């Protein structure tokens, strides 16, 4: 045992939760929901309480990191008497290895904490497990959807602890579990611990840098106090005479996400003047390096959803937009011939400058709306659902339409409109008997049926005039057509 | 109908006479046919003509097909199935299907149906070559143009390559030179006015005089199989009764590129042009190839009167540096965008 | 109205584990001799003939045609068993419990089965041909056959090397089943693919020896005694 | 049957020793000062191709060691599987142990490491100084953009400069003296600028004019058939297609330049070649010239180089020559 | 010409399976006096050396030296399509070419001719075995097998020390190490589990875990596995055949310290 060898992390890490410095509300509403999950399971989670907490019986915790998730969720479960049961990124976390391990300890009772403390009444939950499902963000290794139905079928508090929210890969806990989320602090929440900290290790801090200190480490608090450390071995004093170097030598590469990216680089402050010093290409480019799979993606959705502030005299709006979707088609161009064959890698950052970089600059200025998600990753997955059931209709009437996929969707389908459809409009229920005979004719089913009225657009859109004939047809003609033989 | 009424033979072809003098003097010498590439406008009556040469050379019951699966495996497990339409006599590919793996399939299959030969009764084994038909040869990738080029002169006793294809232009040189090349010209006006009068009166339509199949082929710019699909829905929705007085049925993404280029000329601004990125989603969402949207769209912009020569002249060009660009690219909206950015601001 | 009766499952389930790797659709017809199934390959290389007795009960009104797909046969086969069906059959059923299946509409035109002259006509044990088969298949991917002056020869080219296996006709009389025979009129010599002889070696379970069959222009026979034909077309040339 | 006779000579002059070597002087001087000083740092050899890299670094194997090089001297070419697997198992376990014959340093040719994914090198990036005191390594490449940063530093960077006029000269006179041959000395200055600086295309083009001869022991190799036998275009029509489009009329030079490209089969990708490099000395008395000038005929070229057309790209040529060559008047 | 006919056939294949996954490209020597053969590694570390002489063979007839390159991978293609009870017969020509691999039964005619395309090895022969090693031992297969896969479950180094009548295998890894220490006795009752062991100076040497893996392999042919060591010279693992021997030349790892 050791009291100097300490890291400065663990002889000053908060052994009370009124020592948790910012964030007062999450913390207190999570300590009132772990205090309420026993009353909230005896009427079997079906009567949201005050706050509508009581509805859910798994807790999520996230925010950016180094602000106090763990600390809280260890202290919150040392608090109440309970006892803590913690799986980390460190341990492999799979379906079968998660069934395995912890599922029996999800509705089991503790061995260890009978031993603990039973001759004095303290409180009837220190039996009871808290399983804390720290860092879910990391499942390298059934990381998500088994989790997720851990949280419907769990008997005990399950409290889960991530640092990115609106990751795609964690969209399950959506609304199975209740979630909290716990904010950057401020510089005065942590400005008494650390002052208290300066006075316990002699050395000195002037109170005015320290909101300094919190700006250069955005919200990671033991960044500071790393910081602070590492520096009171040689310079005790700390204060406005050195802190430029401070803040310059020790500042925070974080990776920056589709949205984050998309409004540094489409702002319009960057490509002045001034801020082509402060901000330079090489910065540019490395901000398309750090996620070169959304950026180009983000850029094409919302590059003409701004107002510029660089606009050249003469030059209007629709002119840079132009450029813009010029340079657009050019990067676009590189892309392709980059994930074509040769593997062709080393064509990177002129992909990063054409895609990103060039349109960015042409219409930088100051955004009008919010950042919006990226389409065409859901219009492409849309269209190759359409083209599988195109080919399919196609595959299926080659024996008598004699025409490529593309002829048939152009030419044929206004017409297999007219004569499908179109009975069933004016002649109603009594035109099933001439219907069937023309899809028996080119080996169609109900099936298809339900998928040639959907590819209309236009004028021409089936799926309303679906809803305005009667059910009574429609129950009629899957009947008819089940009954008789092909 | 279109399926209906179709020639079976060379002597029921009624339209370009001298092609089918031509065809019929390619069928004189079976054993001596070299290897075929049809080039022409599209839904001018390539496929029909292809299997009714087909029917002359070999015997009557090449018209019988039949549908089989093929399961194909790349280097990886991504297995792959492509759909093959087979006679006694002969087999059809659609090589398009797969998106850059056409070079696997060519390379398995033509060199499968090569080495081997047709035994069938219909004296045990003696037969002649066996026919391959490659529907849409011009969207054939450069890597798989060159595995069929290759496996021609190989085994030629056996295989006859018999492709077809419009817009002729993306097909190396190398596959343009070491085959024949026949060009399908569009039936004039005079002879798709008699087709369409044929149907007319075997399908027994109630026509007032000769000006409605004059207009549908004057609409359908030549198209035959567009033509009478046109006729069909016009009889159709006419309830048996074809007058001089009925509105032409464009199909509706004809609809929608003509209000496209109405919102275009209209309204030059950036609004506008978000509507037109999203009618260009809607668009190519539901499986229409983007080089026809385009090729639509600027033909319905120069169709437009209240431009002049100088902006017309502009829109052409880049309508051709686009489209350029949209043969070396995956990403079709990406340029379809950036054409009508700068249509926008041509215009003003 | 057909109904046949099998007492084991074991004369059926190595059958159709035989023959159901190459072809998937296999037309059956039922009268009062019994089954036989024809079908042909997809490039028409490989044409299948099935010839069952009903010696292996039986009933059939009159001659009629099935089709079905071996795969669910071979999934629902992994105890007597009898297979049903009635007039029209659109459903054929089975008993062990009932399993229905559904019929699928094939465009295979019957062709008629000859007996014609064969240059040469052999017969040897089916788990010899079989190994000697993966043996040479491992070398190359085309299996040259000639029959010449009384000797059988299987030819492997390569390209790390070349096999070649030679065999005489003997006889024997302490067991019966290694006996190899041979009826020679003129010198044959073919090729094959390998990978159809790879899976056709698979039948070697149903039965103890193979007979194969040469001629000049005509395909190659391979016969397995349940009767199974197999017309395997050569290689024209080069 | 096999003998040394009977290979291409551009293998059968490979250079034994390190004297065989013209040329890279400044190198071949500095390697010898190594290996005779007892010192070898980690070599890195960056180089156009066909210089002499690899038949250096043969000969350097060849004369630390001894007559059998590939014995104790590990070679990893572009041949060999090198993932981040291979540098793991194998060239880890040859530079941890002892040799097998006598007691020296350990050698290691790295030969086109250019074509090593990044992992490859990063994992090598460690290896190569962690076993420094028994093993070296020599890293020979063409493209010195492939190689990471870190790699690149930690071996001595040796560039291999293209083979000026006199070494290839010196080469082309040992080669005619151990051959019964003749060649001319305008063949000599045609064989020199037609080189550039590949010391293979020199070899080959030889062995090509001496089996065009017929008898190859008395008739002198002329530059007619050094010109024929790669259908090089000869400066005489060039110059004359040249200035045929810079001053004759449209029809004329079209036909002088179908009949110069037609007399003995000529290609427009050498033509085109041949006039930037006689029409880069002409002295343009402004700068728009130039800009276009270089530009179209880059257009040309890449156009060419896809095979579009084969009279239309000709006429561009003159049509960009003669739109050049008009902001000067 | 060059024709060795075997007495039985799974001997070559045995003999084969000792070097099987160890080496790739070997080149076979038939002189009068034997079948030689020396292959080196793939990282160039150890260099596996048979010889097999006229005894193992039922015939044997070579008028003059021949050189016979081919990969194992294709030889042992060739073995396995090969039945146990045939008799092996190896043919060569005048010149070196495709060397044929006969396998003939010896009830009913079989005759199974394979041929095999060599490979163009440069002719590099090898002398070693002409160096005086410092100490030279002897045990029974079994024991080193089982001490050698017992050891490297806890390293990839295995340090063997031969000092004053005894020998030491230490290993040295992560989870932990292990020393097994034997001691050279003789026993009458059974002469094969002795371990002889004859020292002039004792010797402290490193090797690889993997390779001692496979020449291990090996033991499946004898059963007393000969190890001579020397400082500054490679390590030799002999199993003695019926007929010849099979010799492994290991490259020791140097060490830092
Ligand atoms: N509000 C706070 N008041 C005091 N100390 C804090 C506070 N937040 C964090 N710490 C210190 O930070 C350390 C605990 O790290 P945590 O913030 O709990 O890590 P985390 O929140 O789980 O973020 P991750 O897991 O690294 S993404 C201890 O040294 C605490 O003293
Ligand atoms: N400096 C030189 N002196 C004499 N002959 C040379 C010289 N350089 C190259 N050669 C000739 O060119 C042949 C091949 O040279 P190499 O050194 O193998 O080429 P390289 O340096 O490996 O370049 P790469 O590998 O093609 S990029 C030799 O066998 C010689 O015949
Ligand atoms: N000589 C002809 N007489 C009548 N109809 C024809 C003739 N030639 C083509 N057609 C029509 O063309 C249609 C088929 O067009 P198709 O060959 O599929 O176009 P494409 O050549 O683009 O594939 C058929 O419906 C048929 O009625
Ligand atoms: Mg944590
Ligand atoms: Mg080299």
């Not at chain 1, 349109?359 to 100051?366: Q, Y």
């Not at chain 3, 190459?22 to 009062?32: A, D, Y």
Request: neutral net charge; aromatic residues 8%.
């Amino acid at each position: 045992v050791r009291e100097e060898d300490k890291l400065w992390t663990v002889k000053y890490a908060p052994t009370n939760l009124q020592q948790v410095c910012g964030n007062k509300g999450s913390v207190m509403k999570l300590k009132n929901w772990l205090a309420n999950w026993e009353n909230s399971k005896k009427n079997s989670f079906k009567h949201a309480g005050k706050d509508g907490s009581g509805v859910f019986r798994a807790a999520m915790l996230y925010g950016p990191p180094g602000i106090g998730k763990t600390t809280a969720a260890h202290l919150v479960a040392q608090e109440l008497g309970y006892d803590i049961l913690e799986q980390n990124a460190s341990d492999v976390r799979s379906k079968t290895l998660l069934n395995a391990g912890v599922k029996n300890a999800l509705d089991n009772m503790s061995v260890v904490g009978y031993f603990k403390h039973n001759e004095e009444a303290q409180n009837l939950n220190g039996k009871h497990f808290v399983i804390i499902m720290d860092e879910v963000d990391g499942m390298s290794g059934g990381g998500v959807g088994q989790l997720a139905q851990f949280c419907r079928k769990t008997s005990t508090p399950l409290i889960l602890i991530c640092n990115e929210r609106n990751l795609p890969k964690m969209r399950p806990f959506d609304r199975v579990c209740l979630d909290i989320q716990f904010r950057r602090p401020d510089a005065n929440s942590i400005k008494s611990r650390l002052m208290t900290i300066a006075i316990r290790e002699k050395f000195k801090l002037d109170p005015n840098v320290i909101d300094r200190l919190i700006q250069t480490t955005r919200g990671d608090i033991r960044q500071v106090i790393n910081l602070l450390s590492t520096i009171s071995t040689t310079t005790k004093t700390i204060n406005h005479e050195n802190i430029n170097e401070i803040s310059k030598a020790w500042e925070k590469n974080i990776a920056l996400k589709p949205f984050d990216i998309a409004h540094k680089m489409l702002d319009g402050q960057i490509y002045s003047d001034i801020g082509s010093r402060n901000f330079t290409l090489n910065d540019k480019i490395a901000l398309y390096f750090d996620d070169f799979d959304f950026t180009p993606l983000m850029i094409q959705e919302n590059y003409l959803s701004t107002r510029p502030s660089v606009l050249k005299p003469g030059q209007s709006h629709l002119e840079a937009v132009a450029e813009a979707a010029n340079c657009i088609s050019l990067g676009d161009i590189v892309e392709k011939k980059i994930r074509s064959s040769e593997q062709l890698w080393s064509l990177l950052p002129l992909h990063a400058v054409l895609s990103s970089v060039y349109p960015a600059s042409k219409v930088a200025g100051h955004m009008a709306g919010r950042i919006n998600f990226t389409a065409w990753l859901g219009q492409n997955s849309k269209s190759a659902k359409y083209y599988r059931l195109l080919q399919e209709i196609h595959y299926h009437t080659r024996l008598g339409t004699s025409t490529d996929k593309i002829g048939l969707r152009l030419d044929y389908l206004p017409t297999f409109r007219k004569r499908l459809l179109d009975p069933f409009l004016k002649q109603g229920a009594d035109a099933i008997s001439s219907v069937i005979e023309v899809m028996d004719d080119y080996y169609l089913t109900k099936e298809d049926w339900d998928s040639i009225m959907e590819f209309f657009v236009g004028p021409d859109v089936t799926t309303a005039i679906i809803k305005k004939i009667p059910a009574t047809v429609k129950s009629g003609f899957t009947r008819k057509y089940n009954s008789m033989t092909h | 109908w279109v399926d209906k009424y179709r020639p079976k033979s060379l002597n029921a072809l009624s339209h370009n006479e001298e092609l089918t003098n031509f065809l019929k003097s390619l069928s004189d010498q079976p054993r001596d046919l070299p290897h075929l590439l049809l080039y022409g406008p599209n839904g001018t009556g390539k496929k029909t003509r292809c299997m009714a040469l087909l029917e002359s050379i070999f015997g009557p019951g090449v018209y019988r097909l039949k549908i089989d699966v093929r399961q194909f495996v790349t280097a990886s497990n991504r297995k792959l199935e492509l759909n093959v339409v087979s006679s006694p006599y002969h087999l059809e590919i659609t090589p398009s299907d797969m998106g850059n793996n056409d070079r696997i399939v060519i390379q398995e299959l033509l060199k499968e149906v090569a080495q081997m030969e047709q035994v069938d009764f219909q004296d045990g084994l003696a037969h002649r070559y066996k026919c391959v038909i490659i529907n849409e040869a011009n969207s054939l990738t450069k890597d798989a143009q060159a595995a069929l080029r290759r496996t021609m002169e190989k085994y030629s006793k056996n295989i006859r390559l018999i492709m077809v294809c419009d817009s002729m232009s993306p097909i190396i040189a190398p596959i343009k030179s070491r085959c024949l090349l026949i060009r399908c010209p569009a039936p004039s006006d005079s002879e798709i006015s008699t087709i369409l009068s044929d149907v007319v009166t075997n399908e027994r339509i109630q026509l007032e005089t000769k000006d409605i199949l004059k207009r549908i082929a004057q609409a359908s710019n030549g198209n035959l199989r567009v033509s009478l699909l046109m006729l069909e829905s016009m009889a159709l929705n006419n309830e048996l009764a074809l007058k001089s007085s009925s509105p032409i049925i464009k199909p509706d993404w004809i609809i929608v590129i003509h209000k496209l280029t109405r919102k275009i000329v209209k309204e030059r601004s950036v609004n506008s042009l978000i509507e037109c990125r999203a009618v260009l989603y809607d668009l190519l969402a539901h499986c229409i190839p983007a080089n026809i949207i385009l090729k639509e769209l600027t033909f319905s912009l120069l169709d437009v009167e209240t431009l002049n020569t100088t902006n017309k002249s502009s829109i052409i060009e880049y309508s051709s540096v686009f489209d350029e660009r949209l043969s070396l690219g995956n990403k079709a909206i990406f340029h379809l965008e950036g054409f009508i950015a700068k249509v926008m601001c041509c215009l003003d | 109205m057909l109904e046949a009766k099998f007492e084991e499952a074991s004369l059926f389930k190595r059958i159709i584990d035989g023959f159901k790797d190459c072809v998937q659709l296999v037309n059956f017809q039922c009268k009062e001799d019994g089954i036989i199934a024809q079908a042909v390959d997809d490039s028409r290389v490989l044409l299948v003939s099935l010839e069952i007795g009903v010696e292996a009960e039986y009933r059939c009104d009159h001659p009629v045609t099935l089709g079905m797909d071996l795969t669910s046969l071979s999934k629902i086969l992994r105890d007597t068993l009898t297979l049903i069906a009635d007039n029209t059959p659109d459903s054929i059923i089975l008993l062990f419990a009932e399993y229905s299946l559904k019929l699928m509409d094939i465009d295979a035109d019957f062709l008629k089965i000859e007996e014609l002259q064969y240059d040469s006509t052999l017969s040897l044990p089916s788990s010899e041909f079989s190994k000697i088969v993966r043996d040479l298949s491992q070398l190359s991917d085309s299996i040259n056959i000639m029959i010449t002056k009384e000797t059988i020869k299987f030819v492997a080219d390569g390209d790390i090397g070349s096999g070649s296996v030679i065999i005489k006709p003997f006889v024997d009389m302490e067991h019966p089943e290694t006996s190899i025979k041979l009826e020679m009129d003129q010198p044959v010599d073919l090729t094959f693919g390998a990978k159809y002889l790879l899976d056709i070696i698979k039948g070697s379970s149903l039965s103890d020896r193979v007979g194969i069959r040469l001629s000049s222009e005509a395909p190659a026979l391979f016969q397995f005694d349940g009767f199974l034909q197999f017309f395997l077309a050569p290689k024209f040339n080069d | 049957k096999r003998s040394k006779e009977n290979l291409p000579w551009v293998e059968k002059y490979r250079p034994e020793t390190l004297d065989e070597v013209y040329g890279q002087n400044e190198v071949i001087t500095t390697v010898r000062k190594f290996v005779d000083e007892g010192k070898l740092p980690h070599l890195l050899f960056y180089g156009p191709p066909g210089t002499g890299k690899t038949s250096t670094i043969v000969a350097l194997a060849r004369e630390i060691y001894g007559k059998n090089y590939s014995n104790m001297v590990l070679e990893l070419n572009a041949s060999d599987d090198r993932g981040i697997d291979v540098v793991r198992n194998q060239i880890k376990d040859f530079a941890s142990t002892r040799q097998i014959f006598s007691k020296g340093f350990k050698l290691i040719i790295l030969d086109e490491a250019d074509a090593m994914t990044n992992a490859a090198q990063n994992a090598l990036r460690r290896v190569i100084e962690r076993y420094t005191k028994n093993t070296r390594f020599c890293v020979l490449a063409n493209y010195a953009h492939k190689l990471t940063p870190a790699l690149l530093s930690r071996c001595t960077r040796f560039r291999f400069q293209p083979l000026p006029q006199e070494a290839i000269e010196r080469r082309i006179a040992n080669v005619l003296v151990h051959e019964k041959l003749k060649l001319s000395p305008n063949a000599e200055k045609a064989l020199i600028e037609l080189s550039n600086g590949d010391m293979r295309r020199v070899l080959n083009v030889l062995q090509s004019c001496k089996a065009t001869l017929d008898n190859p022991d008395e008739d002198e190799i002329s530059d007619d058939v050094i010109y024929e036998c790669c259908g090089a275009p000869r400066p005489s029509d060039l110059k004359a297609v040249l200035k045929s489009i810079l001053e004759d009329d449209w029809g004329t030079a079209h036909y002088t330049l179908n009949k110069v490209r037609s007399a003995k089969g000529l290609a427009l990708i050498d033509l085109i070649e041949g006039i930037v490099k006689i029409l880069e000395d002409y002295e343009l008395q402004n700068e728009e010239t130039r800009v276009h000038l270089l530009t179209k005929l880059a257009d040309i070229e890449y156009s060419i180089s896809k095979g579009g057309n084969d009279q239309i790209q000709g006429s561009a040529v003159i049509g960009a020559i003669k739109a050049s060559f008009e902001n000067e008047t």
